[PDB]
Enzyme design. Structure first.
Site, PDB file in Angstrom:
ATOM      1  N   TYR A   9       0.848  -1.185   0.000  1.00 38.65           N
ATOM      2  CA  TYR A   9       0.000   0.000   0.000  1.00 38.65           C
ATOM      3  C   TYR A   9       0.886   1.237   0.000  1.00 38.65           C
ATOM      4  O   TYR A   9       0.424   2.365  -0.205  1.00 38.65           O
ATOM      5  CB  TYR A   9      -0.926   0.025   1.215  1.00 38.65           C
ATOM      6  CG  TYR A   9      -1.462  -1.337   1.634  1.00 38.65           C
ATOM      7  CD1 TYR A   9      -2.480  -1.971   0.917  1.00 38.65           C
ATOM      8  CD2 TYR A   9      -0.951  -1.984   2.762  1.00 38.65           C
ATOM      9  CE1 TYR A   9      -2.977  -3.208   1.311  1.00 38.65           C
ATOM     10  CE2 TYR A   9      -1.435  -3.222   3.159  1.00 38.65           C
ATOM     11  CZ  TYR A   9      -2.448  -3.834   2.430  1.00 38.65           C
ATOM     12  OH  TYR A   9      -2.911  -5.043   2.848  1.00 38.65           O
ATOM     13  N   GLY A  10       2.168   0.991   0.254  1.00 34.47           N
ATOM     14  CA  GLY A  10       3.145   2.052   0.193  1.00 34.47           C
ATOM     15  C   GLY A  10       3.968   2.093   1.466  1.00 34.47           C
ATOM     16  O   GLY A  10       4.574   1.098   1.844  1.00 34.47           O
ATOM     17  N   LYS A  55       1.308   1.363   8.990  1.00 40.10           N
ATOM     18  CA  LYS A  55       1.183   1.051   7.581  1.00 40.10           C
ATOM     19  C   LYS A  55       0.067   1.926   7.002  1.00 40.10           C
ATOM     20  O   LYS A  55      -1.086   1.806   7.386  1.00 40.10           O
ATOM     21  CB  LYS A  55       0.965  -0.467   7.494  1.00 40.10           C
ATOM     22  CG  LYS A  55       1.022  -1.085   6.116  1.00 40.10           C
ATOM     23  CD  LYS A  55       0.679  -2.568   5.998  1.00 40.10           C
ATOM     24  CE  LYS A  55       1.715  -3.536   6.514  1.00 40.10           C
ATOM     25  NZ  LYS A  55       1.614  -4.859   5.876  1.00 40.10           N
ATOM     26  N   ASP A 108       2.900 -16.323   1.787  1.00 33.81           N
ATOM     27  CA  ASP A 108       4.030 -15.494   1.367  1.00 33.81           C
ATOM     28  C   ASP A 108       5.108 -15.547   2.446  1.00 33.81           C
ATOM     29  O   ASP A 108       5.700 -14.529   2.756  1.00 33.81           O
ATOM     30  CB  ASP A 108       3.661 -14.052   0.983  1.00 33.81           C
ATOM     31  CG  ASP A 108       4.645 -13.412  -0.005  1.00 33.81           C
ATOM     32  OD1 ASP A 108       5.383 -14.151  -0.680  1.00 33.81           O
ATOM     33  OD2 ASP A 108       4.706 -12.186  -0.102  1.00 33.81           O
ATOM     34  N   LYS A 137       8.624 -15.845   3.663  1.00 37.53           N
ATOM     35  CA  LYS A 137       9.956 -15.599   3.152  1.00 37.53           C
ATOM     36  C   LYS A 137      10.651 -14.749   4.207  1.00 37.53           C
ATOM     37  O   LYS A 137       9.972 -14.172   5.050  1.00 37.53           O
ATOM     38  CB  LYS A 137       9.929 -14.919   1.777  1.00 37.53           C
ATOM     39  CG  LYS A 137       9.153 -13.606   1.763  1.00 37.53           C
ATOM     40  CD  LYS A 137       9.295 -12.883   0.432  1.00 37.53           C
ATOM     41  CE  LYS A 137       8.369 -11.730   0.305  1.00 37.53           C
ATOM     42  NZ  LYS A 137       8.451 -11.184  -1.060  1.00 37.53           N
ATOM     43  N   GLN A 167      12.024 -11.865   4.416  1.00 38.66           N
ATOM     44  CA  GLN A 167      11.640 -10.463   4.387  1.00 38.66           C
ATOM     45  C   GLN A 167      10.361 -10.236   5.216  1.00 38.66           C
ATOM     46  O   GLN A 167      10.116  -9.114   5.645  1.00 38.66           O
ATOM     47  CB  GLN A 167      11.344  -9.990   2.957  1.00 38.66           C
ATOM     48  CG  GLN A 167      12.531  -9.962   1.987  1.00 38.66           C
ATOM     49  CD  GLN A 167      12.982 -11.312   1.427  1.00 38.66           C
ATOM     50  OE1 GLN A 167      12.474 -12.407   1.737  1.00 38.66           O
ATOM     51  NE2 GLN A 167      14.000 -11.244   0.584  1.00 38.66           N
TER      52      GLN A 167
END
Lengths: 262, 302
Positions: B19-20, B37, B131, B133, B135
Site C-alpha cells: 500500500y506504500g 502502515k 508469502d 519468506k 523479508q
C-alpha cells in the site's frame, strides 16, 4: 489428505463454533426496523442470489454478504430506499474477501440499475466496514456443511448439492432462521438432504464432532422441512431456479419427503 | 478503533509494501513504539483494497506471540492506517548484515521453533499465509521472531476449494503450485518454512529460480524428479509434462552439508513432494531437532 487438513479440522471446527456466536445477528432486529420487513429482506437476498449467478460468484460469497447485511441491520436503521445500497456494499466486500476475481465496483453500480452512484456504493462500503469493525471472516452455513460432508459413507453429490440448496433457502427468511446458528442450520440441512436422497440419518460420527443430536436439531429440522415443502410456492424463486442447473445436480427438482419420522 | 493520528509521532520511514509507506512511530501518551502502515484510498477507485480487507480482518483474530500484532485501524475518509507492534528488523536483513560467519544453531532452532508455533496458530485458525519468506519474518531485540505481512493470506474452508494460483514468492513456492494443482492447502506454508530453514543454515536461498520452470527444475535437481511412487497423482497434474528431465534424488546430507541428523530429518519432512505426507506445523513442534530449545516463549502483546 492435506486438503481436508486432518491436523487442524477439529481446531478449526471449534474456532468456527466460537466465532459464529460472536458473528451472530440480533434475532429480533427486524421488529426494531421501522421501515423494513422480512419480505423486503427476502426480496434483497433473492436478488443477491441472482447477482451471484449472474457473476458466477462462489456460494460462500453469497453467505458472507447475508451475514454482513444482517449484522449491519442489527445496529443501523435503514430506509427501504437504501436497503439495496447496504446489500450491494455487502456483496462487494464479500467478493473482495472471498473471490479470486471479484467484480469491479462499476459492475456493482450497474446491477443496481443506476439507482446508486459509485461514490454512494464506496461510502456505504466504508460505513459497513466501520459498523462491522472489519470482522469479515464470519463462519457460514457452507463452512460447516463442507466439513459435515466428510462424514458421508460414501460421498454422494446429490446429498451435498441438496444440503447446499436447503442452506441457501434459509438465507431468504429471517423468520425463522435468524434464530439459528449457521452450524445448526447446516446440521439440519445435511440431515434433511441425506434423509431425502438415501433414507439415512445424521451420523453418530457427527454427534461426536458437533455434540448435536436429532433431538437438538429437531426445531430447526421442522422449520427447514416446512421451508422445503413450501418452496415451489414461496414468493422468491431464484434459488430453486439456480439449483435446477446441472452444476448442482438438478437437486431443486427432487421431491421433498412428506414426513421425517422423528 | 480507539486511536487517532494526533497521538502518534512519526520517527522515520522503515519500509514500503503493497500500500506504500510504513513508518516507525511513537505513541506520545503511552510511549509505545509502533509501525504505521498507511493505505491511501483517494488513489483507490475500487474502494478499500481486498489485500487490506483480508489483512485487517484476518489479523484481528490472530493473537499469538509469533504473529505480528495489529493494535488498531485508523479509518479516515481519505486514508487507512494500520497500527502494528514494532519489530526492529527482518530475517533477511539479519542474515545479510550480521550472519556472515553464520547464524548459530541455538538461534536457528529457536527461530524455526517460534515460526512453527506462529504457523500452527494460523492453520488452527483456518488461515493460509502464502508469502512466507525471510523479508516477512520480523525479529525484535528480545530474540522473538514473528510472521508478518498478511496481505497475501486467505481464510480457507475445509476441505479447501480452488484459490488464487501462483501465490508465494517464487523461491519459496511449493511444487503443487508450480504444477498448477487444482487444490493447495496448509502444506504450502510448510514448504516455504522448509526453504527458510535451509536458508538460515547457509544464508542463501535453497531454490533460487528465475522462472516457474527453472524453479521446478532446481527443485527436481535437489530432491530428484518426482514419480508416481514418491508422489501419487504427480504425473496427472495440469502442468506436469512427461518430457520433464528425470534427475536422481541426492543424499540429503549434500543439500545442506552442515546440518546434523535431526536437522536433516526435519528438513526432509518439510520438503516432502507429496503435500499429504509433508509434515504439519503442529507435528513439527515435537521433532527431536527441538529437544534442546530453552529460549522462553515470548509473552502475548496487548
Amino acid at each position: 489428505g492435506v486438503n481436508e487438513v486432518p491436523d487442524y479440522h477439529e481446531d478449526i471446527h471449534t474456532y468456527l463454533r466460537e466465532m459464529e456466536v460472536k458473528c451472530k445477528p440480533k434475532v429480533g432486529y427486524m421488529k426494531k426496523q421501522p421501515d423494513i420487513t422480512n419480505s423486503m429482506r427476502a426480496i434483497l437476498v433473492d436478488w443477491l442470489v441472482e447477482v451471484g449467478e449472474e457473476y458466477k460468484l462462489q456460494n460462500e460469497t453469497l453467505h458472507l454478504a447475508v451475514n454482513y447485511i444482517d449484522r449491519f441491520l442489527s445496529s443501523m436503521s435503514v430506509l427501504r430506499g437504501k436497503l439495496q445500497l447496504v446489500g450491494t456494499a455487502a456483496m462487494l466486500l464479500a467478493s473482495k474477501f472471498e473471490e479470486i476475481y471479484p467484480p469491479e465496483v462499476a459492475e456493482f453500480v450497474y446491477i443496481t440499475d443506476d439507482t446508486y452512484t459509485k461514490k454512494q456504493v464506496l461510502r456505504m462500503e466504508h460505513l459497513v466496514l466501520k459498523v462491522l469493525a472489519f470482522d469479515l471472516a464470519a463462519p457460514t452455513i457452507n463452512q460447516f456443511l463442507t466439513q459435515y460432508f466428510l462424514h458421508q459413507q460414501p460421498a454422494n453429490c446429490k446429498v451435498e448439492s441438496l444440503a447446499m440448496f436447503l442452506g441457501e433457502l434459509s438465507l431468504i427468511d429471517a423468520d425463522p432462521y435468524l434464530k439459528y446458528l449457521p452450524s445448526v442450520i447446516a446440521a439440519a440441512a445435511f440431515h434433511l438432504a441425506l434423509y431425502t436422497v438415501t433414507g439415512q440419518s445424521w451420523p453418530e460420527s457427527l454427534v461426536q464432532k458437533t455434540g448435536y443430536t436429532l433431538e437438538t436439531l429437531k426445531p430447526c429440522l421442522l422449520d427447514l422441512h416446512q421451508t422445503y415443502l413450501r418452496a415451489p410456492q414461496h414468493a422468491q424463486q431464484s434459488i430453486r431456479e439456480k439449483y435446477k442447473n446441472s452444476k448442482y445436480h438438478g437437486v431443486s427438482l427432487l421431491n421433498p419427503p412428506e414426513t421425517l419420522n422423528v | 478503533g480507539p486511536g487517532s493520528m494526533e497521538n502518534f509521532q512519526k520517527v522515520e520511514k522503515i519500509g514500503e509494501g503493497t500500500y506504500g509507506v510504513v513508518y516507525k512511530a511513537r505513541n506520545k501518551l503511552t510511549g509505545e513504539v509502533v509501525a504505521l502502515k498507511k493505505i491511501r484510498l483517494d488513489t483507490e477507485t475500487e474502494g478499500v483494497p481486498s489485500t487490506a480487507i483480508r489483512e485487517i480482518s484476518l489479523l484481528k483474530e490472530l493473537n499469538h506471540p509469533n504473529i505480528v500484532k495489529l493494535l488498531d485501524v485508523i479509518h479516515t475518509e481519505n486514508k487507512l492506517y494500520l497500527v502494528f507492534e514494532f519489530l526492529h528488523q527482518d530475517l533477511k536483513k539479519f542474515m545479510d548484515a550480521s550472519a556472515l560467519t553464520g547464524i548459530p544453531l541455538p538461534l536457528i532452532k529457536s527461530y524455526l521453533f517460534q515460526l512453527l508455533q506462529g504457523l500452527a496458530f494460523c492453520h488452527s485458525h483456518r488461515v493460509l499465509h502464502r508469502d512466507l519468506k525471510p523479508q516477512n519474518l520480523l525479529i525484535n531485540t528480545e530474540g522473538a521472531i514473528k510472521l508478518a505481512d498478511f496481505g497475501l493470506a486467505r481464510a480457507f474452508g475445509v476441505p479447501v476449494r480452488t484459490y488464487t494460483h501462483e501465490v508465494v514468492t517464487l523461491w519459496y513456492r511449493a511444487p503443487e503450485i508450480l504444477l498448477g494443482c487444482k487444490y493447495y492447502s496448509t502444506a504450502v506454508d510448510i514448504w516455504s518454512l522448509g526453504c527458510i530453514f535451509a536458508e538460515m543454515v547457509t544464508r542463501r536461498a535453497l531454490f533460487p529460480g528465475d522462472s516457474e520452470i527453472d524453479q521446478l527444475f532446481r527443485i527436481f535437481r535437489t530432491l530428484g524428479t518426482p514419480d508416481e511412487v514418491v508422489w501419487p497423482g504427480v504425473t496427472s497434474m495440469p502442468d506436469y509434462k512427461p518430457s520433464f528431465p528425470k534427475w536422481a534424488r541426492q543424499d540429503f546430507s549434500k543439500v545442506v552439508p552442515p546440518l546434523d541428523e535431526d536437522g536433516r530429518s526435519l528438513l526432509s519432512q518439510m520438503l516432502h513432494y507429496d503435500p499429504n505426507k509433508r509434515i504439519s506445523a503442529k507435528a513439527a513442534l515435537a521433532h527431536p531437532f527441538f529437544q534442546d530449545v530453552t529460549k522462553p516463549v515470548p509473552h502475548l502483546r496487548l
